[PDB]
């Protein structure tokens, strides 16, 4: 299966999984991989991935100002 795919920078070191999600409602990534280095620490970027590419440029529009407080950076990486 493919997805399309939106790269996220500049997310908070205590925002996980859940919060992508809460940040893109009502707008639904199938799956949200939350990026680590090698010792498990948060490297304050993402990727969450789309079922469709409708839904990929919606949510590049359509999402909360900030995670917690702060802003993030959405990239559109294409398919896959």
Known sequence: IEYYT???????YTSFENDVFKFFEPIRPANVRINYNKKGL????????????????????RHREQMGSRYIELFYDGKT
């Open 6 to 12: 939106i790269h996220m920078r500049g997310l908070p």
């Open 42 to 61: 948060h490297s304050g970027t993402a990727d969450a991935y789309f079922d469709t590419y409708e839904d990929s440029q919606v949510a590049m529009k």
